């Protein structure tokens, strides 16, 4: 069994740039190890698309991380994600007659 | 020196980011072996650009919100209402004047 499908799977789930140009079998060498495997199946097996940020992301947290500004960790991160999370419905701000008024 | 910084790095980054089990931990020859040739670049990718789960909910939320409270509408509606807070405190020192 090609064991280095389920690699490229991942480096695709990362949003590499080459990870099209990269065959299963061209690092089939990685995967040849159980030292190596020890770890290459937890990658493989444990790693989404969800534990990657976009470049756009990362760069807006690099400039906020120079702003100083305090960073949304624990109870004030899931704090503000749940008041965005209950803003998701329909919510009547950003309303352009009251800034008139 | 690239190819053991590398490794060393991506040990750590492993370890302390993603909880990667001991026994499931990649050791110092095995990081060597995989960043060598091909592997030291698109490694170096995951360590910039892949993080655990909680690092990544953390960054999201703190733009999501930050952005948010950061948007000129935002700003525009405070100082609007700070300039209605300034004139009826005006209305009210002009009025003493008087």
Known sequence: MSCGNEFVETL???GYPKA???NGEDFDWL???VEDESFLKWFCGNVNEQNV??????????????????????????????????????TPRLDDKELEK | MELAQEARELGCWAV????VP????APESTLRRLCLGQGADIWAYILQHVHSQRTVKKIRGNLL????????????????EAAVTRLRA????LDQSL
């Not at chain 1, 991380?65 to 803003?87: M, N, R, Y």
């Not at chain 2, 509408?73 to 405070?78: I, M, P």
């Open chain 2, 22 to 25: 001991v026994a499931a931990r």
């Open chain 2, 90 to 93: 005006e209305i009210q020192e």
């Open chain 1, 20 to 22: 099209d140009n990269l």
């Open chain 1, 12 to 14: 695709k789930k990362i």
């Open chain 1, 31 to 33: 995967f040849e190890g």
């Open chain 1, 53 to 90: 940020l976009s470049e756009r992301e990362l760069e807006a947290f690099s400039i906020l991380q120079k702003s100083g500004k305090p960073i949304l960790e624990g109870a004030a991160l899931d704090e503000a994600l749940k008041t965005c999370k209950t803003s998701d419905l329909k």
């Open chain 2, 16 to 19: 302390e980011e993603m909880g």
């Open chain 2, 65 to 80: 919100w930050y952005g948010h409270q950061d948007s000129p509408q935002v700003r525009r509606k405070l100082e609007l």
